[PDB]
């Protein structure tokens, strides 16, 4: 016997007490150890409505990750609201770790186990758990990295696909690796490598899903129409360095109408001057460290926006987007909601 409810959650993790790595340090003081034998009870003949777009767990994780970044990735200079802040800006060890979100006494988390669940509506296979799965708090745009995969078909998530102002989340069912590197000795020059055969196969499957939602209209991908570099480029943080990558080459319509099924290499740049995703101001960091900077990640999702208009063409156009970091958390927490016992 329960009802939907909000409360302050706590976090659990496997952070290492001997690590200097920044996610570990934060978690050692802010989270508790995980349960090696977590209990999960499946509820027979039970149906629940979920709404991933209104799930306060999302709001709480955002607050947490902001706090983490505010304490850690402090810049040499911070320009916010007209003031200038100068402080020490040492190089750090940076590599996200999985974080579990857990309910306090008197509360529990319901989990939707429907394989093709889109994030909103009734769920027939519901279980109760104390903690979510382990989520790495990866901040990125355009492409979702190192996340969890869909268990069956690719899933399109939107509060309302017909409403062009709502961001679309594409949940992939098969991972595509992205290999970004700054070769040892222009210190800001980098590049990301993507399997063109795997990627072009997978993106098309996404297109077939979009056709299912848009009355079999033609699906076209296009580059972003504008905005800050953090949104128009695939931005993320690798080993403490802020990478900005051009994804123009990723969404090329031509190769699936040849000679494309090869390796795709995107040009990237490490930036010292960044627009903080925290929404405050501009931040200045020190030049990149020396040597080979390499991060290999799984692409597990895509963030899209569909073009608005008074149109009635035979095409629907989608462009990579994001910038609302809440969407990143939404993509992982979509199957969970908090309820109050008694």
């Amino acid at each position, epitope marked *: 016997v329960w009802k939907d409810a909000d409360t302050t959650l706590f976090c659990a993790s496997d952070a290492k007490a001997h690590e200097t790595e920044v996610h570990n340090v934060w978690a050692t003081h802010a989270c508790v150890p995980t349960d090696p034998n977590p209990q999960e009870i499946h509820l027979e003949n039970v149906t629940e409505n979920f709404n991933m777009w209104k799930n306060n767990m999302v*709001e709480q994780m955002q607050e947490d990750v902001i706090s983490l970044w505010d304490q850690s990735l402090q810049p040499c200079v911070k320009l916010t609201g007209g003031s200038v802040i100068k402080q020490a800006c040492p190089k750090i060890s940076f590599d996200p770790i999985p974080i579990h979100y857990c309910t306090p006494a008197g509360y529990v988390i319901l989990k939707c186990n429907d394989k093709n669940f889109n994030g909103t509506g009734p769920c027939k296979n519901v279980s109760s758990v104390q903690c979510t799965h382990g989520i790495k708090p990866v901040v990125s745009t355009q492409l979702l990295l190192n996340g969890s995969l869909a268990e069956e078909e690719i899933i399109i998530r939107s509060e309302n696909l017909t409403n062009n*102002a709502k961001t679309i989340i594409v949940h992939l069912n098969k991972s595509v690796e992205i290999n970004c590197t700054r070769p040892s000795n222009d210190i800001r020059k980098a590049y990301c490598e993507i399997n063109g055969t795997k990627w072009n196969k997978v993106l098309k499957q996404v297109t077939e899903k979009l056709k299912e939602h848009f009355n079999n209209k033609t699906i076209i991908f296009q580059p972003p*129409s504008g*905005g800050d570099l*953090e*949104i128009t480029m695939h931005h993320f943080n690798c080993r403490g360095e802020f990478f900005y990558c051009n994804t123009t080459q990723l969404f090329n319509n031509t190769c699936i109408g040849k000679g494309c099924n090869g390796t795709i290499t995107l040009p990237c740049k490490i930036k010292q001057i960044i627009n903080m995703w925290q929404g405050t101001g501009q931040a200045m960091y020190a030049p990149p460290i020396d040597g080979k900077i390499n991060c290999v990640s799984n692409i597990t999702g895509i963030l899209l926006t569909r073009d*608005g*208009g008074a149109n009635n063409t035979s095409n629907e156009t989608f462009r990579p987007g994001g910038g*609302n970091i*809440k969407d990143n958390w939404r993509s992982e927490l979509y199957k969970y909601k908090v309820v109050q016992i008694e």
Partner: antibody, heavy 132, light 100 residues
Framework: QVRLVQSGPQIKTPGASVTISCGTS????????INWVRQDIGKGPEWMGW????????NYGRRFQGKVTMTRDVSSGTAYLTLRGLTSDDTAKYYC?????????????????????????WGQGTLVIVSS | VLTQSPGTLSLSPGETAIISCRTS????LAWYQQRPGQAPRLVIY???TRAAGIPDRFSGSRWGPDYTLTISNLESGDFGVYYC?????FGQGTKVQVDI
């Protein structure tokens, strides 16, 4: 007190460029998407596009693709619209609009989280004439 | 996607003006009011919900695809052109004409 104050009217030569402003005050400029609408008397209102004050994300209508760019100044809390390669067809009045708010005092809000289309707040508009 | 009708209503104070608007799609609808030379003013939003500061004389209703806005006891303050709106789509407009 949620006021939208647009810049004054202006005439331009066929081919020039217009940059009209949209002054905002009385609300956190970063929590609401800002739309742009075009009204030519003789016809009805036409939505041109919205921009997210947060990241700068824009959604241009296919009919206005390449003739329209939407920017912003997070400092002054001001939205902007610049028109490229003016023709006699661009002779119209241009509004900057936003919908009803849904944040309700939350600390971290994004304009893409609200509905946006319930246009309650309009500017006074700005006349742009493209004639020789 | 949107078809508003009629184009012009020549009515008088006291009478009840009826403005219809058929949609190919469906969902949330708003009704706007444009006094000559002035910016449009939100009157009905989300279908039937009356906006703030709107007198009871204005009300929204539906029956199938044909959305309607009925205005009871007209006054000269109700003069102007009205538009229906689904998301970013607007109607052609209904020019309601006040009279003396």
């Amino acid at each position: 007190q949620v006021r939208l104050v647009q810049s004054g009217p202006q005439i331009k030569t066929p081919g020039a460029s217009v940059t009209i402003s949209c002054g905002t005050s009385g609300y956190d400029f970063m929590e609401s998407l800002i739309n742009w609408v075009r009204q030519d008397i003789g016809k009805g209102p036409e939505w041109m596009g919205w921009i997210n004050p947060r990241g700068g994300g824009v959604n241009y209508g296919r009919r206005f693709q390449g003739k329209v760019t939407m920017t912003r100044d997070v400092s002054s809390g001001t939205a902007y619209l610049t028109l490229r390669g003016l023709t006699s067809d661009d002779t119209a009045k241009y509004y900057c609009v936003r919908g009803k708010s849904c944040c309700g005092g939350r600390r971290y809000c994004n304009g893409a989280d609200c509905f946006n289309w319930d246009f309650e707040h309009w500017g006074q508009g700005t006349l742009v004439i493209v004639s020789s | 996607v949107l078809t508003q009708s009629p184009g012009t209503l020549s009515l008088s104070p006291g009478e009840t003006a009826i403005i219809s608007c058929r949609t190919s799609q469906y969902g949330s609808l708003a009704w706007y009011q444009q006094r000559p030379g002035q910016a449009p003013r939100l009157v009905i939003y989300s279908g039937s919900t009356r906006a703030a500061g709107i007198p009871d004389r204005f009300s929204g209703s539906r029956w199938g695809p044909d959305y309607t806005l009925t205005i009871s006891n007209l006054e000269s303050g109700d003069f102007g052109v009205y538009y229906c709106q689904q998301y970013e789509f607007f109607g052609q407009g209904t020019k309601v004409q006040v009279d003396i």
